[PDB]
């Protein structure tokens, strides 16, 4: 994920102009299981699927 204030793709002449640039939606979060240690009291156990977007 690359963040820039200029509305120019990475393949543009002004940018580095290398590789294919694609827009990204949403944020990236490391894989983890909610409430693994039962730290949250009275909280529903959440299930996370790897490579799953929802």
């Amino acid at each position: 994920y690359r963040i820039g204030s200029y509305y120019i793709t990475e393949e543009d002449i002004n940018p580095g102009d290398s590789i294919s640039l694609g827009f990204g939606s949403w944020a990236k979060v490391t894989g983890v299981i909610m409430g693994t240690g039962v730290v949250n009291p009275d909280g529903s156990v959440p299930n996370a699927q790897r490579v799953e977007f929802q």
Binding site: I33, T36, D42, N47, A48
Partner: protein
């Protein structure tokens, strides 16, 4: 030059790929533990050592049920599927819901003693998953024999 070999190559289908000039390529299979990659000379008694280790791929800790709905005073069970045998279980507000790891540590017996929403964790090794266990009220509606009685 040197020749790369691995004693008891069973970690993969091709344990040690032949080296082209100096370096070579490695392979992996369904095995866990360390490995030995010795780069020994053709005839000389010189053998370098390169450490390798493929620890059973990922972990993939995932509870059997993401959410639970048990009544007050009831009991349940959660069969966690984890590669590592030791799987410690815990649950906040133990007075509401309690958790006890199984004999193999894979399963976890739940006991919703109290009432209220709470989460129960498990798989303390590496990555710890979560599973909500709502201690909903029993609401076992009892009914009197008579209501409009005349004593």
């Amino acid at each position: 030059n040197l020749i790369w070999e691995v004693s008891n190559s069973s970690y993969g289908s091709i344990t040690v790929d032949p080296s082209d000039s100096k370096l070579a390529t490695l392979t992996s299979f369904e095995k866990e533990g360390n490995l030995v990659v010795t780069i020994s000379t053709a005839n000389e008694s010189v053998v370098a050592q390169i450490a390798v280790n493929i620890i059973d791929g990922d972990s993939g800790i995932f509870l059997s049920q993401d959410t639970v709905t048990i009544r007050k005073g009831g009991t349940t069970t959660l069969t966690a599927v984890t590669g590592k045998t030791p799987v410690t279980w815990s649950s906040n507000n133990a007075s509401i819901v309690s958790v006890t790891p199984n004999a193999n540590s894979l399963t976890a017996v739940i006991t919703a003693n109290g009432e209220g929403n709470v989460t129960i964790t498990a798989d303390n090794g590496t990555k710890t998953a979560s599973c909500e266990i709502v201690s909903i009220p029993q609401i076992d509606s009892i009914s009197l024999s008579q209501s409009d009685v005349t004593v």
